[PDB]
Amino acid sequence: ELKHSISDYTEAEFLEFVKKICRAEGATEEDDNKLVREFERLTEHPDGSDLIYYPRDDREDSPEGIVKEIKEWRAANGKSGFKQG
Numbered sequence: 001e002l003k004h005s006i007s008d009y010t011e012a013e014f015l016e017f018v019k020k021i022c023r024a025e026g027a028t029e030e031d032d033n034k035l036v037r038e039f040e041r042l043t044e045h046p047d048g049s050d051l052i053y054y055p056r057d058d059r060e061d062s063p064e065g066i067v068k069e070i071k072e073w074r075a076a077n078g079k080s081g082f083k084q085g
Contacts, residue, residue, distance in 0.1 A: 005042065005080050006042035006043060006080050006081075006082065007080040007081050007082060007083055008083060009042075009082055009083060010082055010083045010084065010085035011067065011071070011082045011083075011084070011085075012085070013082075014039075014067055014070075014082055015063055015064060015067040016063075017035075017039045017067075018051075018052060018063040018066045018067060019063045020035070021035050021036060021039075021052055022052075022063060033049070036048070036049045036052060037049070043070045043074060043079070044074070044079055045069075045070050045073060045074065047069075048066075048069075048070060051066045051069050051070070052066055056069070
């Protein structure tokens with residue numbers, strides 16, 4: 001199914017983005033990263049890719065905390081959001 005934006009995805013569906021990347025890595029980094037790249041365009045997030053790969057400081061390294069980064073960041077930045085569902 002196609003979406004109009006990341007705001008079409010709910011918080012949960014997007015929180016599955018990361019959970020999905022965690023499982024659907026494929027094999028080589030390429031199959032993992034190619035998922036990351038599309039999601040990171042949807043978020044327009046800077047370090048979104050790195051969110052998955054390298055934990056920050058006071059952030060929760062969890063699929064939820066990775067979402068929370070993107071969530072808190074975009075909300076402060078005037079980006080799109082998620083759908084509430």
